[PDB]
Design a protein around this ligand. Structure first.
Ligand SMILES: N[C@@H]1[C@@H](O)[C@H](O[C@@H]2O[C@H](CO)[C@@H](O[C@@H]3O[C@H](CO)[C@@H](O)[C@H](O)[C@H]3N)[C@H](O)[C@H]2N)[C@@H](CO)O[C@H]1O
Ligand SMILES: N[C@@H]1[C@@H](O)[C@H](O)[C@@H](CO)O[C@H]1O
Length: 242
């Protein structure tokens, strides 16, 4: 689906979207007051949503005695109810940062990203018949921020509403640029007006990333060819960085 240069490009763009830097933030760990508890890692794994749990569980099967093991009971409870409480995760941010110095922990983050976000987003693209690299990037960025749940803010509902609006999918002959433009506008509307009010401030301030994908679409860079200029947060980045 994506070239090696296109995937590194996608990762550096989404990294800029989320953290204003093309360097993947494996060691990032923060409370954002968005209802999700602690948000951590290169894809923003989260205490409330179960993806932070999967990372630590998989890592603990590779390395039973790690500094993150004591949080497994609590994370288990938090994931089971989608709870945003950060008790008692005291010390978890620092331990996540330290664990991220181990390439094997970073590798687990890569595997989870691939399993939860990249491969499902590419499977969605294939079902849609989507073939422009820009559409793949837009689906991949959206799956990371919105998730693949069944809520009206999730990627699957956004795709469904895009297809309803334009009367079909690209594999059915709807021009893919039209489908993509509709998807980006629907995505910006969801970020501005989410059904989950706890993420409203967080998501509302993140709409420049949809603007950046729209800018690439309007400039005809649907194939993600270099150089790519991203300046979502004011700072200008030319990608790929070498
Ligand atoms: N990092 C979060 C992101 O986790 C979150 O959303 C969640 O994403 C999950 C992974 O896509 C997802 O779960 C899956 O749900 C499908 C339902 O079809 C199950 O079949 C899979 O087995 C699940 N793994 C969650 O439902 C989804 N909410 C996102 C927004 O809440 O926040 C990101 O920052
Ligand atoms: N509120 C957002 C979620 O949408 C997701 C995760 C992805 O990085 O980050 C959080 O900030």
């Amino acid at each position: 689906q994506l070239t090696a240069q296109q995937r590194l490009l996608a990762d550096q763009i989404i990294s800029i979207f989320a953290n204003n830097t093309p360097e993947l933030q494996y060691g990032y760990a923060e409370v954002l007051d968005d209802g999700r508890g602690i948000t951590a890692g290169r894809a923003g794994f989260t205490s409330a949503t179960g993806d932070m749990l999967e990372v630590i569980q998989r890592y603990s099967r590779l390395r039973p005695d790690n500094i993150l093991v004591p949080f497994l009971p609590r994370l288990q409870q938090l994931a089971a109810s989608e709870d945003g409480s950060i008790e008692g995760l005291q010390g978890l941010p620092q331990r996540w940062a330290d664990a991220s110095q181990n390439p094997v922990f970073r590798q687990v983050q890569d595997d989870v990203v691939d399993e939860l976000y990249f491969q499902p987003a590419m499977e969605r693209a294939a079902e849609l018949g989507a073939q422009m690299p820009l559409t793949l990037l837009a689906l991949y960025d959206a799956i990371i921020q919105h998730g693949e749940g069944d809520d009206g803010d999730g990627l699957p509902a956004m795709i469904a509403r895009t297809t309803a609006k334009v009367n079909g999918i690209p594999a059915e002959g709807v021009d893919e640029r039209r489908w993509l433009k509709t998807f980006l506008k629907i995505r910006k509307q969801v970020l501005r007006h989410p059904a989950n009010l706890e993420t409203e401030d967080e998501w509302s301030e993140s709409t420049g990333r949809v603007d950046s994908l729209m800018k690439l679409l309007k400039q005809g860079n649907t194939d993600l060819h270099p150089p790519i200029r991203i300046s979502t947060w004011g700072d200008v980045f030319i990608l790929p960085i070498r």
